[PDB]
Scaffold this motif. Structure first.
Motif, short mmCIF file in Angstrom:
data_model
loop_
_atom_site.label_atom_id
_atom_site.label_comp_id
_atom_site.label_asym_id
_atom_site.label_seq_id
_atom_site.Cartn_x
_atom_site.Cartn_y
_atom_site.Cartn_z
N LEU A 112 -24.00 -13.33 -27.71
CA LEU A 112 -23.55 -13.19 -29.11
C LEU A 112 -24.74 -12.91 -30.02
O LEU A 112 -25.86 -13.44 -29.79
CB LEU A 112 -22.83 -14.46 -29.57
N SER A 113 -24.47 -12.06 -31.03
CA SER A 113 -25.44 -11.74 -32.13
C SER A 113 -26.70 -11.01 -31.59
O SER A 113 -27.71 -11.04 -32.32
CB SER A 113 -25.79 -12.96 -32.94
N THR A 114 -26.66 -10.32 -30.45
CA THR A 114 -27.86 -9.62 -29.90
C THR A 114 -27.77 -8.11 -30.12
O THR A 114 -28.77 -7.43 -29.80
CB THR A 114 -28.13 -9.99 -28.42
N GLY A 115 -26.63 -7.59 -30.56
CA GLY A 115 -26.38 -6.15 -30.73
C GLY A 115 -26.47 -5.79 -32.21
O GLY A 115 -27.47 -6.14 -32.84
N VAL A 116 -25.39 -5.26 -32.78
CA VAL A 116 -25.43 -4.79 -34.20
C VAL A 116 -25.51 -5.99 -35.16
O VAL A 116 -25.94 -5.80 -36.31
CB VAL A 116 -24.28 -3.81 -34.50
N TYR A 117 -25.27 -7.24 -34.73
CA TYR A 117 -25.42 -8.46 -35.57
C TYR A 117 -26.82 -9.08 -35.45
O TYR A 117 -27.07 -10.15 -36.03
CB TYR A 117 -24.33 -9.49 -35.20
N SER A 118 -27.75 -8.44 -34.73
CA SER A 118 -29.10 -9.02 -34.47
C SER A 118 -30.03 -8.92 -35.69
O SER A 118 -31.11 -9.53 -35.68
CB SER A 118 -29.77 -8.37 -33.28
CL CL Z 1 -23.66 -8.30 -31.84
#
Ligand code: CL
Ligand code: MPB
Ligand code: CL
Length: 163
Positions: A112-118
Motif C-alpha cells: 500500500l501507498s508505494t505507487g501513485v500514492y507514494s
Molecule cells: Cl499506491
C-alpha cells in the motif's frame, strides 16, 4: 489457518493470484482508479458495489464467493509524513481484521501507498514493515505482489532476514 503460515513474494499481476482472497490498493471513492486498483476493477468489477471507505480502513465486498478487501492507504502527496505513516499502519491493521474474519487460509497483498500514492518517494521498507506488524499475528499464507525486479529482490531479502 495455513499448516505452517508463511510469507512469499511474487513479481506478477495480483489479478492472477493463486490465493483465497485479494487486497485491493483502493482509492477512498471506490473508483476504478489506476495501477493495482484498475487491474482489480477489470478482474472483479462486481466487488466495487458500495466499496468506498475512508483512508486507513478496509472494506470487503464479495465477487461471487471470492473476497476483495478494499484497503485505502494514504496519498503522501496530501498527508504529512507523520499522519501518512499512522494511516498506512492503520490500513494494514484493518486488512488483518478482515483476513481473520473471512477465515481464509491465504491472501494476495500489494504494498500500500508505494505507487501513485507514494508522494514520489521509495516506501518499500515503510510499507512492508507496516504489513508485517499487522499480519504477523494472522495465520494466513501471505503472498506479496510487486511489478519490478529490484523490489522483488529487496522484499525477498526482508522476508529471509526474519527466518
Ligand atoms: Cl499506491
Ligand atoms: C503487483 O501489482 C499488480 O498486481 C499490478 C497490476 C496491474 C498494474 O497496472 C500494476 C500493478
Ligand atoms: Cl503477470
Amino acid at each position: 489457518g495455513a499448516m505452517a503460515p508463511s510469507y512469499r513474494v511474487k513479481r506478477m499481476d495480483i489479478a492472477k493470484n493463486d490465493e483465497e482472497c485479494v487486497v485491493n490498493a483502493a482509492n477512498p471513492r471506490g473508483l476504478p482508479g489506476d495501477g493495482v486498483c484498475k487491474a482489480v476493477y477489470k478482474k472483479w468489477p462486481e466487488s466495487f458495489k458500495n466499496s468506498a471507505t475512508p483512508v486507513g480502513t478496509a472494506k470487503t465486498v464479495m465477487c461471487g464467493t471470492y473476497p476483495v478487501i478494499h484497503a485505502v492507504g494514504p496519498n503522501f502527496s496530501n498527508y504529512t509524513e507523520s499522519e501518512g505513516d499512522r494511516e498506512l499502519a492503520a490500513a494494514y491493521r484493518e486488512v488483518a481484521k478482515e483476513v481473520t474474519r473471512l477465515g481464509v487460509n491465504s491472501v494476495a497483498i500489494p504494498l500500500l501507498s508505494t505507487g501513485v500514492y507514494s508522494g514520489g518517494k521509495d516506501r518499500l521498507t515503510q510499507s512492508l514493515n507496516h504489513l508485517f506488524t499487522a499480519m504477523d499475528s494472522t495465520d494466513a499464507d501471505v503472498v506479496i505482489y510487486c511489478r519490478d525486479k529490484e523490489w522483488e529482490k529487496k522484499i525477498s531479502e526482508a522476508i529471509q532476514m526474519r527466518t
